[PDB]
Design an enzyme around this catalytic site. Sequence first.
Site, mmCIF file in Angstrom:
data_model
loop_
_atom_site.group_PDB
_atom_site.id
_atom_site.type_symbol
_atom_site.label_atom_id
_atom_site.label_comp_id
_atom_site.label_asym_id
_atom_site.label_seq_id
_atom_site.Cartn_x
_atom_site.Cartn_y
_atom_site.Cartn_z
ATOM 1 N N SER B 197 0.812 -1.222 0.000
ATOM 2 C CA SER B 197 0.000 0.000 0.000
ATOM 3 C C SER B 197 0.840 1.264 0.000
ATOM 4 C CB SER B 197 -0.958 0.026 1.188
ATOM 5 O OG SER B 197 -2.231 0.461 0.783
ATOM 6 N N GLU B 324 -9.068 -5.206 -3.716
ATOM 7 C CA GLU B 324 -8.455 -4.033 -3.114
ATOM 8 C C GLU B 324 -9.475 -3.061 -2.494
ATOM 9 O OE1 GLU B 324 -5.353 -3.853 -2.600
ATOM 10 O OE2 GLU B 324 -4.467 -5.355 -3.907
ATOM 11 N N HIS B 437 -7.407 -5.974 0.527
ATOM 12 C CA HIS B 437 -6.253 -5.108 0.703
ATOM 13 C C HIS B 437 -5.494 -5.476 1.990
ATOM 14 C CE1 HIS B 437 -4.052 -1.568 -0.321
ATOM 15 N NE2 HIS B 437 -4.439 -0.843 0.717
HETATM 16 C C1 C6H Z 1 -9.529 5.353 9.104
HETATM 17 O O1 C6H Z 1 -10.499 5.142 8.156
HETATM 18 C C2 C6H Z 1 -10.995 6.278 7.471
HETATM 19 C C3 C6H Z 1 -10.922 6.363 6.044
HETATM 20 C C4 C6H Z 1 -10.275 5.252 5.101
HETATM 21 O O2 C6H Z 1 -10.513 5.246 3.903
HETATM 22 C C5 C6H Z 1 -9.292 4.204 5.637
HETATM 23 C C6 C6H Z 1 -9.897 2.847 6.102
HETATM 24 C C7 C6H Z 1 -8.626 1.859 6.431
HETATM 25 C C8 C6H Z 1 -8.715 1.274 7.757
HETATM 26 C C9 C6H Z 1 -7.434 0.545 8.063
HETATM 27 N N1 C6H Z 1 -7.045 -0.381 7.033
HETATM 28 C C10 C6H Z 1 -6.033 -1.002 7.322
HETATM 29 C C11 C6H Z 1 -4.910 -1.049 6.269
HETATM 30 C C12 C6H Z 1 -3.619 -0.475 6.834
HETATM 31 C C13 C6H Z 1 -2.463 -0.569 5.831
HETATM 32 C C14 C6H Z 1 -2.234 -2.007 5.389
HETATM 33 C C15 C6H Z 1 -3.507 -2.615 4.815
HETATM 34 C C16 C6H Z 1 -4.694 -2.492 5.764
HETATM 35 C C17 C6H Z 1 -7.170 0.128 5.662
HETATM 36 C C18 C6H Z 1 -8.473 0.842 5.428
HETATM 37 C C19 C6H Z 1 -11.447 7.502 5.416
HETATM 38 C C20 C6H Z 1 -12.046 8.566 6.149
HETATM 39 CL CL1 C6H Z 1 -12.679 9.960 5.294
HETATM 40 C C21 C6H Z 1 -12.124 8.483 7.576
HETATM 41 N N2 C6H Z 1 -12.644 9.356 8.510
HETATM 42 C C22 C6H Z 1 -12.511 8.872 9.725
HETATM 43 C C23 C6H Z 1 -11.867 7.609 9.638
HETATM 44 C C24 C6H Z 1 -11.614 7.357 8.224
#
Ligand code: C6H
EC number: 3.1.1.7
Lengths: 532, 532
Positions: B197, B324, B437
């Site tokens: 990523s 993904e 992902h």
């Molecule tokens: C924190 O989430 C959000 C988003 C997102 O689009 C991100 C969601 C991620 C949560 C963690 N995850 C783990 C990954 C880490 C790297 C290796 C692969 C797995 C990925 C997806 C967007 C907005 Cl606008 C948000 N607002 C508040 C929280 C938040």
Amino acid sequence: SELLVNTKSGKVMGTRVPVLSSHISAFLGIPFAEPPVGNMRFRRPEPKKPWSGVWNASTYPNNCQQYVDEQFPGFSGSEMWNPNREMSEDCLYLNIWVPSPRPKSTTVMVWIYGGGFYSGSSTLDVYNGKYLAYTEEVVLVSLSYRVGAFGFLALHGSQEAPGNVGLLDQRMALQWVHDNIQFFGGDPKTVTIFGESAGGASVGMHILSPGSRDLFRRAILQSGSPNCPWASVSVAEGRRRAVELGRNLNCNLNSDEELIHCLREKKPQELIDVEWNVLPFDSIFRFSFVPVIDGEFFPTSLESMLNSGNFKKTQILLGVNKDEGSFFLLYGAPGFSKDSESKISREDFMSGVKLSVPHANDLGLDAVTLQYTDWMDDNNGIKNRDGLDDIVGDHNVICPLMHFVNKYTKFGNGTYLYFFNHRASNLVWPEWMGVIHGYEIEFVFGLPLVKELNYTAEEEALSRRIMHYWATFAKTGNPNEPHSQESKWPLFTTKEQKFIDLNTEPMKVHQRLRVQMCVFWNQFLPKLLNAT
Amino acid sequence: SELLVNTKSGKVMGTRVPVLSSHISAFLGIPFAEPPVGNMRFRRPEPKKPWSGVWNASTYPNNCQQYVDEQFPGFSGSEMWNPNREMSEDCLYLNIWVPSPRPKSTTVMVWIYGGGFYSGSSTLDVYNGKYLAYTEEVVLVSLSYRVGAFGFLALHGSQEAPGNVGLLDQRMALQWVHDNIQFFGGDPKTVTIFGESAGGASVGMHILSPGSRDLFRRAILQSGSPNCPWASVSVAEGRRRAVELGRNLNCNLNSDEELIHCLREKKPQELIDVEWNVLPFDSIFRFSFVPVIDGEFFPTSLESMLNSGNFKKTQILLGVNKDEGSFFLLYGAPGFSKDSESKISREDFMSGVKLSVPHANDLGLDAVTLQYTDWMDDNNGIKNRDGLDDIVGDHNVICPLMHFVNKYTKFGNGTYLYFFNHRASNLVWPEWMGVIHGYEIEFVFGLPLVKELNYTAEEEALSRRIMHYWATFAKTGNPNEPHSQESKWPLFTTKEQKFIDLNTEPMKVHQRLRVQMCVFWNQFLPKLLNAT
Ligand SMILES: COc1c(C(=O)CCC2CCN(CC3CCCCC3)CC2)cc(Cl)c2[nH]ccc12
Ligand SMILES: COc1c(C(=O)CCC2CCN(CC3CCCCC3)CC2)cc(Cl)c2[nH]ccc12
Ligand SMILES: *[C@@H]1O[C@H](CO)[C@@H](O)[C@H](O)[C@H]1NC(C)=O
Ligand SMILES: *[C@@H]1O[C@H](CO)[C@@H](O)[C@H](O)[C@H]1NC(C)=O
Ligand SMILES: *[C@@H]1O[C@H](CO)[C@@H](O)[C@H](O)[C@H]1NC(C)=O
Ligand SMILES: *[C@@H]1O[C@H](CO)[C@@H](O)[C@H](O)[C@H]1NC(C)=O
């Protein structure tokens, strides 16, 4: 007499012709208008003035002055569309087949020929009304109209060459039928108009036009619709083509009168010779002199009329063939030949789409290309060929018709939709061309019923069920008779959007005809071209 | 002594850790930079100044300050990505696993974590280096870098907050590896950088940036690449967001020095609390503080560099997972739930695309929609779900990477591509999310070798063949053991475009990974948006 008929303009004498071990009555070449000759070139048609004595209605009339196809001389597949008699500006005639004995108040069907508004004839063999008139006991009429410049040269604001006079010819013939068909055992209150390609569009145009609405009951549209891209032009564009026609012939172009007077001295083939030269783009499935959105025959734009429900509300029966596009690639796109399988290179494919969508910008062209290319296989000549075939067919016929069918059904009183996809066992065109633009026509006219034409049992049955659907629709507004279930043609509705396959096989019902491609052609691409 | 090592900056004491019925040496939490604290928040990183005595490198360091995800508290599927150690600005450390006994001059692999440049930890259970180091006998290094505002606040012109400092953290860690890895038995001339990523993107960003190229031999990119739309921003945008961050904190915005001074007095969590507010649009797969195209880390635009061949020419091994997009829909789009099949209504599918392509104009939105909608079945909640999943995955990861892999290969010295599509038998996320992902990572890191984790026999075998690929590639530049029995992963060439599926089944070669869609994202859509 059965053959002798007193009409509102004179006596006509028809002939007894044979058909399928029987006979019916034919009246060929009845005039319905004054010969649009000399000073009346380009002008509205004038009703045929009453004659004394008996009119010989025993033989086909002259054909209208048109471009004549010579790509494949001798070749039946193209020669069957060419004039089969003398060409003249004196061509405003119609033909009638009456079942024998003469019925009382029977359903009338008026054929209107295609040919892209530049050509076409009523006297062609495939439009021989005898089989359909006899098998389905209907009074069958085929009209005629001026084509090319003679029919559609448009110089808006002039009363000498207003445009649309070719449609007005059709209207005058329709008006003639309304006044005289009863004298032939025809019910003028039950007239179905029908036509293919340009004829199809014409049918639709009479649906929209207010001055046309009362001269017929119902409508059948085959492989054409009024909103087709090739089927009309603005007044600005008609004027430009008209003026450009004068230019090709050294005419005075300072005024319409001078321009018009000039073009009237020229011989017909002089006009025809330079006719293709006024097209703006290098294009296929485009024709120089076509209907104009004039504010008169069509009060407002086609789309707005469709939107506001400003058109005749009745029953329509309409449809398309599977390979509407191949004929036009053969005549205008590189890599195509009547004699090979015409596997198309990537280069000829790109070339192709540019010819097919002549008015698109570069983004529009990329859109179309993307829309029809398998990118796991871009150099597959067969997929490239079929792709180009679908682009031409979808864009010019299938998608314009679907847009029409969806629009009309909001206000209509019953829509029936078909997909014709049988390939004649005896087709003289190569296989790659598929189910070709115009080739359902012989089935509608009952040509498979004649044994010497060497069709198959199953094609004769197909034609028989087709003619029956056609005529049954014509008498009742429903192609179905109330038994079987083998099988019922469903009504096309806004929600379920059903249609049927027309072929030798048992009837199948599908939904949403070419919707994926047609969303592109009817909604995305136009929005894109407007935006960019 | 095996566990005591004199590095260029001081002595370091590691610890013997068990792995799979054996043991290796770990060196946990080795500093490579001065703590970027106080007057040095936002500032470029400075090398760690030499220490006296022996460093206890036997425990995991701190995790950088970041947004912690609290959506599913207690839930292991999300919590495996959150900081498993205390957070602090004092976080610039790395970790080393060395085979026992110490190898002489062995292959080095440096892990760079993802987390959208806003989060991520070196100390996660799933990035545990002991299995990979042990099984393939490589020296495995885990770096770290400042995330979010702390790592990527960019105010061009300023020297206090220039942007890109987190990429510079990485560089400095690589520099540390270059200077000290020999003391652990590692070959500094044979270092493979890898990351998923954001890590994946970062890896390619070092490939591009002139000042990073000599710090590693070759590159592995998983599910990320430098040209990803979420992976960078322009000076203008970067400043605008930085200025906006201060606005959200009542900061003096009158100059960079007064803004930076204001933001430097704030506690880290205050920064993180408002972090998301500076995004231009409602979006999914967008993050506020990312690398900038600055003219310094990146001399010119990323696309100009790829075109000119201006980047490191070596071997790359890279790929994607089948789904993904699902992770991000879950956190971002209406209709998606961890606990249902998340069948999506047409209205929600619409909302989805606007959220997912937040920079598209309306024409753009129509194009995306058309490209991914089956118009015979547009109300199919599954097809709408999977389709929105593909939109997100293709736009953000798959298509960027394919653009990158195609451009890179014209100048590179060997490319290997994979499609990872195994769904782990023990996944804790719902079936609809598919191959998620980041869920190839546990396979790369050898977690299925550990019995209590309850992977199947076939998954352990998959992890072993995957680790061997990564290692063999790292050692020789090729994932295959040449002239060995097993089927061979083909080179990706610009002509054949070959790649493999990675799963428990025997290997399949394919060509042109997601061409049809990626032609749309990489060529058509940007042309559409560039127009007016
Ligand atoms: C924190 O989430 C959000 C988003 C997102 O689009 C991100 C969601 C991620 C949560 C963690 N995850 C783990 C990954 C880490 C790297 C290796 C692969 C797995 C990925 C997806 C967007 C907005 Cl606008 C948000 N607002 C508040 C929280 C938040
Ligand atoms: C006249 O040929 C052309 C064309 C064409 O469009 C040829 C295609 C038509 C030719 C004949 N045929 C007519 C229809 C009539 C109605 C029922 C179905 C059959 C099929 C279509 C185009 C250009 Cl640009 C040309 N230039 C010179 C000749 C020429
Ligand atoms: C009508 O014209 C045809 C064709 O020339 C001719 O054979 C026929 O005798 C004519 N009929 C009459 C009644 O004159
Ligand atoms: C046709 O018109 C009649 C009378 O108004 C109406 O009852 C009928 O539902 C209409 N049919 C269709 C298909 O619109
Ligand atoms: C290093 O830290 C560990 C864990 O806190 C501790 O057990 C060990 O004694 C430390 N090493 C030294 C030399 O103090
Ligand atoms: C890599 O570079 C070497 C040295 O120039 C060359 O011999 C080899 O063919 C290259 N390999 C590839 C796959 O480009």
